[PDB]
Amino acid sequence: MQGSWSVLKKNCSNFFPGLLAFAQQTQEAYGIWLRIYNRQQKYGPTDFVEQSETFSPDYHKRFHSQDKNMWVDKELCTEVSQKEVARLMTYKLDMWRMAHCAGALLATGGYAIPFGLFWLANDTWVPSSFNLTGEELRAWREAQDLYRYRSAPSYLTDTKWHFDFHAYPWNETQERAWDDLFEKNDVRRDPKVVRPAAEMYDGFIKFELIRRKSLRHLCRSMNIPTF
Amino acid sequence: EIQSRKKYFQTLGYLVAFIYLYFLMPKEKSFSGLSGPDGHWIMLPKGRPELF
Amino acid sequence: MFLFFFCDLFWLRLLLCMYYCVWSRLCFIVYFNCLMLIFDFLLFCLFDLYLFVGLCLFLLLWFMLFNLYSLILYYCITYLNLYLLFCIVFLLYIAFLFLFCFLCDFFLFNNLLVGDSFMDVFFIRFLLCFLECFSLLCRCLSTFLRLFCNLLSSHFLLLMFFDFFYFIFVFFFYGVFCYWFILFIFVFCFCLLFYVFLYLLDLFAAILQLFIFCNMILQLIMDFLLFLLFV
Amino acid sequence: STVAISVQGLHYVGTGLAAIALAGVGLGIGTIFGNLLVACARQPNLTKMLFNYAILGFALTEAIGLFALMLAFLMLFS
Amino acid sequence: STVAISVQGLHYVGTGLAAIALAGVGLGIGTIFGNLLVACARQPNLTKMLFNYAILGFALTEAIGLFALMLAFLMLFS
Amino acid sequence: STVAISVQGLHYVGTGLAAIALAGVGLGIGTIFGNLLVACARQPNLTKMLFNYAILGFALTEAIGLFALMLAFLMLFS
Amino acid sequence: STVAISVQGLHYVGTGLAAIALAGVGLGIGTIFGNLLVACARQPNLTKMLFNYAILGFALTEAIGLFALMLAFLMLFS
Amino acid sequence: GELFVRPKLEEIPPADQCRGFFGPLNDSLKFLRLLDIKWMMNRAVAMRREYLIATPTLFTFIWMFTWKGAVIYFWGDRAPPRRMDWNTEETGRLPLGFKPTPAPL
Amino acid sequence: SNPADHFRPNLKALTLYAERQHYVDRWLHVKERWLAPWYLPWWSPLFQLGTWYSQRSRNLFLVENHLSYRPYKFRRNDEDRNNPY
Amino acid sequence: TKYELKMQYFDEWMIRWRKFQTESDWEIEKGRQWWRRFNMAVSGALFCGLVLYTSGTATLKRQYGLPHFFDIGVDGQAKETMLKTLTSRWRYTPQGYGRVLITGVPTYILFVTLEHYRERRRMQQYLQQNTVFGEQMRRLLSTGKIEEYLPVNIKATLPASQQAIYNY
Amino acid sequence: FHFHDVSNDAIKGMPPSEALHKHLENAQLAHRICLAKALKAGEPPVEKCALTWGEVLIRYQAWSEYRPPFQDSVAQAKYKKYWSKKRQEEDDKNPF
Amino acid sequence: VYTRWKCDRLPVFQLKLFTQEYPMHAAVGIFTIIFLWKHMSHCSEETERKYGWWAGYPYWRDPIARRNETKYKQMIINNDVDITHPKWTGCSVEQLEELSRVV
Numbered sequence A: 001m002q003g004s005w006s007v008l009k010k011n012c013s014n015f016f017p018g019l020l021a022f023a024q025q026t027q028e029a030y031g032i033w034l035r036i037y038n039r040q041q042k043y044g045p046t047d048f049v050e051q052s053e054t055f056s057p058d059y060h061k062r063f064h065s066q067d068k069n070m071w072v073d074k075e076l077c078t079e080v081s082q083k084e085v086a087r088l089m090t091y092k093l094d095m096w097r098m099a100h101c102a103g104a105l106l107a108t109g110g111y112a113i114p115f116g117l118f119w120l121a122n123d124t125w126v127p128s129s130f131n132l133t134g135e136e137l138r139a140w141r142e143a144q145d146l147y148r149y150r151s152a153p154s155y156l157t158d159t160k161w162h163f164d165f166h167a168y169p170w171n172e173t174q175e176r177a178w179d180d181l182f183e184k185n186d187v188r189r190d191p192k193v194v195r196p197a198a199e200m201y202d203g204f205i206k207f208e209l210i211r212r213k214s215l216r217h218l219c220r221s222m223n224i225p226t227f
Numbered sequence B: 001e002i003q004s005r006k007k008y009f010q011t012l013g014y015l016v017a018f019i020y021l022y023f024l025m026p027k028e029k030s031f032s033g034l035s036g037p038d039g040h041w042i043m044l045p046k047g048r049p050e051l052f
Numbered sequence C: 001m002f003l004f005f006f007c008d009l010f011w012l013r014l015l016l017c018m019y020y021c022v023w024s025r026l027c028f029i030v031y032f033n034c035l036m037l038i039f040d041f042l043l044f045c046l047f048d049l050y051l052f053v054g055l056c057l058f059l060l061l062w063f064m065l066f067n068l069y070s071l072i073l074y075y076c077i078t079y080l081n082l083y084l085l086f087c088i089v090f091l092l093y094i095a096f097l098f099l100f101c102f103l104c105d106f107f108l109f110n111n112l113l114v115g116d117s118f119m120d121v122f123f124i125r126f127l128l129c130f131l132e133c134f135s136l137l138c139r140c141l142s143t144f145l146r147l148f149c150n151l152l153s154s155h156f157l158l159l160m161f162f163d164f165f166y167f168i169f170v171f172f173f174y175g176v177f178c179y180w181f182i183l184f185i186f187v188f189c190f191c192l193l194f195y196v197f198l199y200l201l202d203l204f205a206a207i208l209q210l211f212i213f214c215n216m217i218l219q220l221i222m223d224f225l226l227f228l229l230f231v
Numbered sequence D, E, F, G: 001s002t003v004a005i006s007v008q009g010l011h012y013v014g015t016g017l018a019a020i021a022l023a024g025v026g027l028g029i030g031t032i033f034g035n036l037l038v039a040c041a042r043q044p045n046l047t048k049m050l051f052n053y054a055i056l057g058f059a060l061t062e063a064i065g066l067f068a069l070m071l072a073f074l075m076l077f078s
Numbered sequence H: 001g002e003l004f005v006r007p008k009l010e011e012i013p014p015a016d017q018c019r020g021f022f023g024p025l026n027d028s029l030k031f032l033r034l035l036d037i038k039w040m041m042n043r044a045v046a047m048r049r050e051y052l053i054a055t056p057t058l059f060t061f062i063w064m065f066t067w068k069g070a071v072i073y074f075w076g077d078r079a080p081p082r083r084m085d086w087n088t089e090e091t092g093r094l095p096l097g098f099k100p101t102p103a104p105l
Numbered sequence I: 001s002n003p004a005d006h007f008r009p010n011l012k013a014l015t016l017y018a019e020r021q022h023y024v025d026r027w028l029h030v031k032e033r034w035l036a037p038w039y040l041p042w043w044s045p046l047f048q049l050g051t052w053y054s055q056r057s058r059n060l061f062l063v064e065n066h067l068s069y070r071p072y073k074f075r076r077n078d079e080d081r082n083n084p085y
Numbered sequence J: 001t002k003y004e005l006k007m008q009y010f011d012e013w014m015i016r017w018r019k020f021q022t023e024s025d026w027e028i029e030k031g032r033q034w035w036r037r038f039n040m041a042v043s044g045a046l047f048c049g050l051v052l053y054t055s056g057t058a059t060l061k062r063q064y065g066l067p068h069f070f071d072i073g074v075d076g077q078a079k080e081t082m083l084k085t086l087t088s089r090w091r092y093t094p095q096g097y098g099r100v101l102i103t104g105v106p107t108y109i110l111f112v113t114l115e116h117y118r119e120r121r122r123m124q125q126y127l128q129q130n131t132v133f134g135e136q137m138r139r140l141l142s143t144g145k146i147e148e149y150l151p152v153n154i155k156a157t158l159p160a161s162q163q164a165i166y167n168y
Numbered sequence K: 001f002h003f004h005d006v007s008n009d010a011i012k013g014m015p016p017s018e019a020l021h022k023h024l025e026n027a028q029l030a031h032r033i034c035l036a037k038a039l040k041a042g043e044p045p046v047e048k049c050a051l052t053w054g055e056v057l058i059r060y061q062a063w064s065e066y067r068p069p070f071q072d073s074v075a076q077a078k079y080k081k082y083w084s085k086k087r088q089e090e091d092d093k094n095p096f
Numbered sequence L: 001v002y003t004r005w006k007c008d009r010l011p012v013f014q015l016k017l018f019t020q021e022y023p024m025h026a027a028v029g030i031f032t033i034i035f036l037w038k039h040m041s042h043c044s045e046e047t048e049r050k051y052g053w054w055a056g057y058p059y060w061r062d063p064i065a066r067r068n069e070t071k072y073k074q075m076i077i078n079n080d081v082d083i084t085h086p087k088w089t090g091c092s093v094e095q096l097e098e099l100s101r102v103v
């Protein structure tokens, strides 16, 4: 979404209330994350807690492994509720963007003010707390969805083109899953037909071998700041 | 459409530049001094008596 | 000292604007090997091995606009300087080398230590590693030197031969009306043949040198590429 | 006593020496084509491919001769 | 008596002599490609692998010429 | 002291050296034809394609000899 | 100081060097006839076409020899 | 060329098997392993840690080909002359009777 | 000589000269002007980027104690090998 | 206070008029260089310590575990001691931007603070000098401008064989 | 007045500081001579003495930049290390 | 759909190209530019006379001297420099007047 004067006025008016709400959310999310981290450290598997190293087979560069470095706490409901988890995720996004902005401010002193004016003129990188009414929240969500639309096709095309140019599926079912995986949203994709693509790509590329450009595209599509 | 207009203007500018360069612009530092500049200094201090 | 000058491509820039305001397909490329690095299927690389395509195409375009058109008399190769070519090759080669080094994978350099465990490490293998590390920089220097020297020598020879041809054509054409016309005709035919041969040779050599210039960079890149197999 | 002498004509001698480098290059090029003929008669189906490799070798070998020729011009024109 | 003389055109001679080393480099390159052309016709299926080794020799053969070329400049420009 | 000397007859010396560059060129040409005969004798049906390549090799080798010959005549007239 | 010297025995030295190139020609002749015999033995039916091609090779190689020989005689009498 | 796999802990030969410049630096000579460069090279090769030999070399070349080469060329100290112009340590001092300005306060 | 003269750029238009001292001083003035305001604390990465490397280089120059003589960078004549002055 | 903006002009002038550099000023600059090296060393030590503290448990086990390159015995003892010391207590082992911040921000802050205060110290030292450089520094801090050709204006000391210029 | 000899032969066996000071003195002498001529003619000095002033300026810049090295432990160590007895004998033997 | 080359304007695409596509090359180029302007941006008057002119230095008018004369005149006039100061001349003003009366 392009910046505008109306959004600039909206964000300037709600700047300090937004900061206060962000601080309150920060306290709440710190509590939630403290609970979750204590539970992970206490009941987590040895590999997950010790941060086992998984290196690539070509350049031996460490990256997170989906099987070992990711763990699902099946018994987290006892300590943390679903709503708390959703709140933590939203706060993580908002805190990421706020941290990048604060880093820019600290780095450039008082010279970031015009860049701050550019920032407040667009809802793409402002926290959700800056919206105090339903219409403002709707506009903010629209901006986020616009950014997702802008970013996702590049990631999908990167993945599909690389795989198709450097590899082909083994069997017919894998072919069907691969072809139907990248259909447009106007048609409904059957998850059962599409699932084998997961194993096929695990054969091709895992999350531990994800390239940096593809990662940048994915982070763009997840509204995660990249600079 | 955009590129056609931009390239039309670029072509006119490059045509003018080519004409000026290859038919009007004199070469610097001529032996006779009849054409072109011999160079000069810039960024000279001004209003700084303490500098000397 | 600040000198203001211009390249000799303004007319060619005008032609590019005129003839490429609309799209056109490209099917013939001087260095096609930058697009097809992998020839065995199911092999793939996690490194950005296709990053050099754009630079390769732009360099080919620039050097072709300069060198090929330089055969036209009085056309100037504005970039024809030894240290400028050194700067260009330094940029490209060192940028790719630092891309490989910033990866912080020291095992990538294991192949520098040439030979097997049977060979003495200190007196054979270490010396070979030293020589290879030196040979990388020597390859860069050789690339830029070759590119410079080929053009310089070709154009020197062309200028000298053209001067000789002008001299004989102007100051000895009257021999056509004289009794020694046959000698002049033979000399003139030989000069025409040499003219054609030199032009063909230069045309071919320019393209070939550009091919080699890009191939050296691609070889640098390939020397550190590792291919995984799909399963 | 300190005497400094500058002989002009020496540049001719150095120029002629560099030309000797062409003897190896000219011979080297002929070697490539000799193998090319003796290879095309052993596998004519690849004549076009071999001709391509022969030309590449000719340029690399020729490139060296230019290096020497450049030095000849430098000294001959200085 | 002690007499010191400085002949100022001798660096041309040394430069030409160093340039002569390029004849061997050119000849060696021609030999490599001559063997390549006569070897591909024998085992065409491995043509590509041979070409890689041929270039390697050129990379390790052209480098020597650079040293001789390097000396030429160090004496031509001094 | 500053002494400038101009030796005239040196141009004869440099010219003779460039003539030596034709030794490899003449040898290289002879090598091509010698290989041509073997290829023709071992593959008599290709008496024209081989002949064309032999001519091409001779032209390139002749070109190298002519580059040197230009210096040989140029210095002789300098 | 400006000193001009004219040595009248250096038109001999250049002449001798130009004669050296003949060796590269004379050896080239033997190579063509060295391989002609082998080709004749391999394919006696082509004793004629090979002989003509060998004559062409010898003449072209001799052409290089006479180009060098011209420089040899010019500097001998000048 | 091909992919590199680090050796397992059981595939690494013992340190005592490594050889130095003259011979193995076994018991009563272990502390000499630190000083013997060839022994360290052989140990690294045995442990497949060849990069320790190659990485310092290449980088060094780069460091000379990029930054130190020009630094030496443009700012390096050449050989000193025979007759040396040492400093008399007389310059710089203020003259007698000069009234220096007061320091900030 | 004449053939060598054919390898020069053919479209030279203007040449400008400037002393190193003058433009270095002007650059220092600009840097001070932009780094002076209070809203850029000295501990900011921007300020350190601006100042620290220059300070280090100048200190290295001052500390230099070379036994040889380095001729002035901007002499009138630097082509005579036997006259460093 | 921003001492670098004031000191850059003084450093450039000293480089331009380095002839009048007394041995005291040379010692001052050598001490500044030594303190810069010391600050670099301490900042690097802090960075290494922070990196080691935040390192993952498996990473520490791999780094400070078998095999031993030398196998002298002291190497293994030291590695085991360090590994036990690190793995005994609980350590915050962040990854990504968090580790970057933790390892860098303290190091940058320490280095910058030390360098800034050493620059202030050098300014004070040059203020206390009784040479032409000290007078130039004091005049710069007073009037705010660098007075070039000062040494010849106030006739700073010269070698006995070069006092003819002052002969007026 | 008398100009110092700053020719290559004289400069060869001279310390850098002495040569720089001699150049500066020669520049000052030339500048004052030109100024005296201008005053005698009565014409403005700026319109006649500009080039001499610039020469004095450049000589001043060259002269003030050079600081002779201090004789200390490391400098003396370097000088003695390079100038060994063998090197001194070789230098004495060399006629150049 | 969105593409950098087709949707973004030229400056934005330039920044993106040289920051997220070829950043290392840009860094090396800037380094080399700085080196060239720090060590290869000076030309002495003798060098200009030898090689700085297309057909040769026209000594019959010495444009370098005129250029330096204009430079020094401008500097003196703008900065209000007293070229008669003893430091410039090496002698007092009275000695200068005595010399003027002598010559």
Ligand SMILES: CCCCCCCCCCCCCCCCCC(=O)OC[C@H](COP(=O)([O-])OCC(O)COP(=O)([O-])OC[C@@H](COC(=O)CCCCCCCCCCCCCCCCC)OC(=O)CCCCCCCCCCCCCCCCC)OC(=O)CCCCCCCCCCCCCCCCC
Pocket: A026, A029, A030, A033, A095, A096, A097, A098, A099, A100, A101, A102, A103, A104, A106, A107, I043, I044, I045, J094, J095, J096, J097, J098, J099, J100, J101, J102, J103, J104, J105, J106, J108, J109, J110
């Ligand atoms: C004054 C000096 C200044 C120096 C110069 C600085 C120049 C600017 C550089 C940037 C500095 C930081 C800027 C502020 C960031 C905000 C704080 C923060 O870390 O946010 C968390 C967040 C962590 O990100 P993450 O990816 O989630 O972390 C993954 C970890 O696994 C996360 O671990 P986890 O999964 O276990 O989750 C933990 C999480 C769990 O907690 C929660 O979930 C609760 C929320 C906690 C975080 C809240 C953040 C709020 C941010 C917004 C603040 C308000 C802004 C208001 C703006 C408007 C004001 C008017 O809690 C954390 O986030 C803890 C992270 C670790 C702490 C990092 C801080 C270390 C530095 C501070 C101490 C310094 C001591 C100095 C001692 C000196 C001794 C001599 O920070 C970021 O978003 C990362 C920064 C993004 C910008 C990067 C820019 C480049 C940086 C390069 C630095 C290189 C070194 C320095 C030299 C530079 C030279 C060029």
Ligand SMILES: CCCCCCCCCCCCCCCCCC(=O)OC[C@H](COP(=O)([O-])OCC(O)COP(=O)([O-])OC[C@@H](COC(=O)CCCCCCCCCCCCCCCCC)OC(=O)CCCCCCCCCCCCCCCCC)OC(=O)CCCCCCCCCCCCCCCCC
Pocket: A001, A002, A003, A100, A101, A102, A104, A105, A112, A113, A115, A116, A117, A118, A119, A120, A121, A122, A124, A125, A227, L011, L012, L015, L016, L019, L027
């Ligand atoms: C009070 C507030 C609260 C407190 C403060 C809070 C904190 C605030 C700060 C933090 C805020 C963060 C978020 C910011 C978001 C907005 C960012 C932004 O700018 O968005 C684009 C923003 C528009 O954004 P938008 O419309 O919302 O669209 C956003 C889309 O989502 C499009 O999105 P996109 O992603 O496609 O766009 C991204 C685009 C962003 O970029 C752009 O879009 C380009 C913006 C500039 C375009 C300029 C075009 C016009 C040029 C005009 C030229 C002059 C004309 C003639 C003038 C004549 C005047 C008389 O590309 C990039 O991100 C590239 C990044 C490049 C990074 C560069 C890093 C360099 C590193 C160097 C290498 C180091 C290596 C290591 C070395 C180590 C050595 C030891 O651009 C503008 O608004 C354009 C402004 C143009 C101003 C006028 C022209 C310049 C005037 C200069 C005046 C100079 C005066 C002094 C002169 C002195 C002379 C001596």
Ligand SMILES: CCCCCCCCCCCCCCCCCC(=O)OC[C@H](COP(=O)([O-])OCC(O)COP(=O)([O-])OC[C@@H](COC(=O)CCCCCCCCCCCCCCCCC)OC(=O)CCCCCCCCCCCCCCCCC)OC(=O)CCCCCCCCCCCCCCCCC
Pocket: A100, A101, A103, A104, A107, A108, A111, A125, A216, A225, A226, A227, I034, I045, I046, I049, L010, L011, L014, L015, L016, L018, L019, L020, L023, L024, L026, L027
């Ligand atoms: C036709 C001609 C037209 C005109 C052409 C003009 C001439 C251009 C010629 C040359 C162009 C190419 C130059 C390339 C250089 C080499 C680049 C390189 O090696 O990059 C590697 C690498 C590539 O970056 P990347 O992160 O991989 O991705 C870059 C993509 O563009 C990221 O893209 P993305 O899509 O992934 O993310 C999009 C989005 C994602 O959204 C976000 O990330 C959220 C928002 C983030 C806000 C920023 C957070 C920053 C956090 C702290 C960063 C570390 C600070 C370090 C300490 C400070 C050092 C100063 O991010 C943004 O929207 C970024 C907005 C940035 C706006 C500013 C862009 C520059 C405009 C000019 C302003 C400055 C003018 C100064 C000169 C004039 C003065 C009078 O760079 C970095 O790692 C970034 C380091 C950044 C360090 C800070 C900047 C250092 C440079 C000096 C700053 C001086 C400031 C002066 C202030 C005023 C003083 C008076």
Ligand SMILES: CCCCCCCCCCCCCCCCCC(=O)OC[C@H](COP(=O)([O-])OCC(O)COP(=O)([O-])OC[C@@H](COC(=O)CCCCCCCCCCCCCCCCC)OC(=O)CCCCCCCCCCCCCCCCC)OC(=O)CCCCCCCCCCCCCCCCC
Pocket: B009, B010, B011, B012, B013, B014, B016, B017, B020, B021, C002, C003, C004, C005, C006, C007
């Ligand atoms: C003191 C005397 C004056 C001089 C002062 C200089 C101050 C210097 C300061 C110190 C600088 C130190 C460093 C210098 C390093 C130099 C290195 C160098 O030269 O490298 C060679 C290198 C050569 O590159 P190249 O490969 O030849 O390509 C560059 C070309 O520009 C072509 O590249 P391109 O085609 O890729 O470029 C993009 C091109 C894309 O193509 C086009 O846009 C086509 C047009 C091309 C124009 C540019 C070519 C110029 C051709 C020659 C001149 C044309 C005729 C001029 C007539 C003058 C008559 C006196 O677009 C443009 O050029 C954009 C500008 C378009 C302007 C259009 C204006 C329209 C006005 C319409 C008005 C209508 C009014 C109606 C009123 C009605 C009332 C009723 O130069 C450069 O790369 C650029 C160097 C520039 C460095 C910065 C210099 C500072 C800025 C000075 C501006 C002075 C303005 C005031 C002048 C006033 C008249 C006297």
Ligand SMILES: CCCCCCCCCCCCCCCCCC(=O)OC[C@H](COP(=O)([O-])OCC(O)COP(=O)([O-])OC[C@@H](COC(=O)CCCCCCCCCCCCCCCCC)OC(=O)CCCCCCCCCCCCCCCCC)OC(=O)CCCCCCCCCCCCCCCCC
Pocket: C098, C101, C102, C103, C104, H059, H060, H062, H063, H066, H067, H068, H071, I060, J033, J036, J037, J038, J040, J041, J043, J044, J045, J048, J049
């Ligand atoms: C990750 C990247 C991968 C990709 C790489 C891509 C590139 C290719 C690679 C090759 C590089 C290509 C070059 C590209 C251009 C880059 C720029 C450049 O070349 O600039 C050079 C450029 C050269 O300087 P320059 O401008 O030519 O001026 C020369 C002057 O010397 C300047 O004067 P200054 O005042 O600046 O001082 C400089 C000073 C720099 O040094 C210092 O300032 C002091 C030391 C700093 C240490 C830093 C921290 C190290 C760690 C501390 C401890 C940690 C552990 C703590 C816990 C311990 C527990 C027990 O050095 C010296 O002057 C020499 C002093 C040496 C004293 C030796 C005294 C004797 C005793 C010690 C040695 C012998 C020990 C024998 C033991 C025997 C036992 C049996 O800059 C410098 O080198 C100096 C400034 C930067 C210093 C950075 C210091 C940190 C370096 C990194 C250390 C960590 C990484 C390495 C190890 C990694 C292991 C995995």
Ligand SMILES: CCCCCCCCCCCCCCCCCC(=O)OC[C@H](COP(=O)([O-])OCC(O)COP(=O)([O-])OC[C@@H](COC(=O)CCCCCCCCCCCCCCCCC)OC(=O)CCCCCCCCCCCCCCCCC)OC(=O)CCCCCCCCCCCCCCCCC
Pocket: A060, A061, A062, A063, C104, H059, H063, I045, I046, I048, I049, I052, I053, J043, J048, J051, J094, J095, J096, J097, J099, J100, J103, J104, J105, J107, J108, J111
């Ligand atoms: C204006 C500001 C200017 C700033 C200038 C300073 C530089 C820029 C500042 C920072 C800029 C922001 C971005 C930085 C890069 C971020 C990289 C990143 O994303 O890391 C993520 C990563 C987090 O991911 P993770 O999953 O948690 O862990 C990584 C995985 O392990 C990854 O797993 P893996 O599988 O990849 O494992 C491999 C990994 C393992 O490494 C790691 O990741 C561990 C952390 C690094 C350890 C480094 C120390 C190693 C030991 C050194 C021992 C030295 C002993 C010397 C003794 C000398 C005695 C005399 O990488 C390596 O193996 C690389 C090792 C390093 C090799 C260094 C080679 C240097 C060659 C030098 C050549 C010659 C130079 C010239 C000549 C000099 C001498 C004359 O971050 C880190 O691990 C640490 C980040 C630290 C960031 C840098 C902090 C900067 C602090 C600056 C303070 C000083 C300021 C001075 C200012 C001056 C005035 C302006």
Ligand SMILES: CCCCCCCCCCCCO[C@@H]1O[C@H](CO)[C@@H](O[C@H]2O[C@H](CO)[C@@H](O)[C@H](O)[C@H]2O)[C@H](O)[C@H]1O
Pocket: J027, J030, J031, J032, J034, J042
């Ligand atoms: C967080 C750390 C804070 C540290 C605060 C201060 C700690 C106490 C003082 C530390 C010691 C200081 O003592 C320091 O000694 C060294 C010599 O070894 C001196 O250095 C002196 O001799 C060395 C000898 O090589 C020279 O290189 C140097 O140029 C010279 O100045 C320093 O001028 C002095 O400051």
